[PDB]
Design a protein around this motif. Structure first.
Motif, PDB file in Angstrom:
ATOM      1  N   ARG A 146      -5.192  -1.395  -0.105  1.00  0.00           N
ATOM      2  CA  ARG A 146      -4.905  -2.788   0.300  1.00  0.00           C
ATOM      3  C   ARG A 146      -6.169  -3.539  -0.122  1.00  0.00           C
ATOM      4  O   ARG A 146      -7.255  -3.209   0.359  1.00  0.00           O
ATOM      5  CB  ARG A 146      -4.731  -2.880   1.813  1.00  0.00           C
ATOM      6  N   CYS A 193      -6.863  -9.175   1.452  1.00  0.00           N
ATOM      7  CA  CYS A 193      -5.687  -9.152   2.305  1.00  0.00           C
ATOM      8  C   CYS A 193      -6.027  -9.227   3.769  1.00  0.00           C
ATOM      9  O   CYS A 193      -5.142  -9.469   4.620  1.00  0.00           O
ATOM     10  CB  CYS A 193      -4.826  -7.923   2.011  1.00  0.00           C
ATOM     11  N   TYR A 239      -0.778 -12.501   3.852  1.00  0.00           N
ATOM     12  CA  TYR A 239      -0.508 -11.199   4.447  1.00  0.00           C
ATOM     13  C   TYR A 239      -1.311 -11.117   5.721  1.00  0.00           C
ATOM     14  O   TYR A 239      -2.549 -11.286   5.748  1.00  0.00           O
ATOM     15  CB  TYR A 239      -0.908 -10.075   3.483  1.00  0.00           C
ATOM     16  N   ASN A 255      -5.796 -14.890  -0.224  1.00  0.00           N
ATOM     17  CA  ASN A 255      -4.665 -14.532   0.622  1.00  0.00           C
ATOM     18  C   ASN A 255      -3.736 -15.725   0.825  1.00  0.00           C
ATOM     19  O   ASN A 255      -3.597 -16.309   1.937  1.00  0.00           O
ATOM     20  CB  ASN A 255      -5.196 -13.934   1.927  1.00  0.00           C
ATOM     21  N   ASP A 303       5.709 -11.985  -2.717  1.00  0.00           N
ATOM     22  CA  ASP A 303       4.525 -11.876  -3.542  1.00  0.00           C
ATOM     23  C   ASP A 303       3.354 -11.353  -2.691  1.00  0.00           C
ATOM     24  O   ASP A 303       2.524 -10.554  -3.148  1.00  0.00           O
ATOM     25  CB  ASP A 303       4.179 -13.239  -4.140  1.00  0.00           C
ATOM     26  N   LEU A 315       3.493  -9.375  -0.011  1.00  0.00           N
ATOM     27  CA  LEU A 315       3.716  -7.974   0.276  1.00  0.00           C
ATOM     28  C   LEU A 315       3.408  -7.128  -0.937  1.00  0.00           C
ATOM     29  O   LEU A 315       2.847  -6.012  -0.817  1.00  0.00           O
ATOM     30  CB  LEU A 315       5.140  -7.728   0.760  1.00  0.00           C
ATOM     31  N   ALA A 316       3.793  -7.615  -2.125  1.00  0.00           N
ATOM     32  CA  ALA A 316       3.516  -6.828  -3.327  1.00  0.00           C
ATOM     33  C   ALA A 316       2.015  -6.617  -3.566  1.00  0.00           C
ATOM     34  O   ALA A 316       1.593  -5.570  -4.028  1.00  0.00           O
ATOM     35  CB  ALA A 316       4.181  -7.452  -4.556  1.00  0.00           C
ATOM     36  N   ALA A 317       1.201  -7.652  -3.281  1.00  0.00           N
ATOM     37  CA  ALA A 317      -0.240  -7.554  -3.491  1.00  0.00           C
ATOM     38  C   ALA A 317      -0.933  -6.732  -2.403  1.00  0.00           C
ATOM     39  O   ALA A 317      -1.909  -5.982  -2.673  1.00  0.00           O
ATOM     40  CB  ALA A 317      -0.826  -8.955  -3.595  1.00  0.00           C
ATOM     41  N   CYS A 318      -0.466  -6.871  -1.187  1.00  0.00           N
ATOM     42  CA  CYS A 318      -1.197  -6.426  -0.009  1.00  0.00           C
ATOM     43  C   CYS A 318      -0.572  -5.290   0.783  1.00  0.00           C
ATOM     44  O   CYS A 318      -1.242  -4.752   1.667  1.00  0.00           O
ATOM     45  CB  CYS A 318      -1.380  -7.603   0.949  1.00  0.00           C
ATOM     46  N   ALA A 319       0.700  -4.998   0.580  1.00  0.00           N
ATOM     47  CA  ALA A 319       1.372  -3.919   1.308  1.00  0.00           C
ATOM     48  C   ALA A 319       2.086  -2.997   0.311  1.00  0.00           C
ATOM     49  O   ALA A 319       3.262  -2.552   0.605  1.00  0.00           O
ATOM     50  CB  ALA A 319       2.414  -4.537   2.223  1.00  0.00           C
ATOM     51  N   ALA A 320       1.466  -2.766  -0.870  1.00  0.00           N
ATOM     52  CA  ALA A 320       2.140  -1.991  -1.970  1.00  0.00           C
ATOM     53  C   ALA A 320       2.913  -0.690  -1.513  1.00  0.00           C
ATOM     54  O   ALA A 320       2.761   0.501  -1.903  1.00  0.00           O
ATOM     55  CB  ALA A 320       1.166  -1.691  -3.131  1.00  0.00           C
TER      56      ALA A 320
END
Length: 57
Positions: A1, A5, A23, A43, A50, A52-57
């Protein structure tokens, strides 16, 4: 993460009232916030997806 984030959401100094997403790692969720239109931090995303994709992969 990515570490960004964990940043609190940052509205900045602008007077616009734009809906953006951050996030919220404590909540494990992407959440809407008001962005003033200038001085964005990382953030800050156009959509929950978008964020979630960056921060909760």
């Amino acid at each position: 993460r990515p570490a960004f984030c964990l940043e609190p959401p940052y509205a900045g100094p602008g007077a616009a009232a734009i809906i953006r997403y951050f996030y919220n790692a404590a909540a494990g969720a992407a959440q809407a916030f008001v962005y003033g239109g200038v001085a964005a931090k990382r953030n800050n995303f156009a959509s929950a997806a978008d964020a979630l994709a960056a921060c909760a992969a």
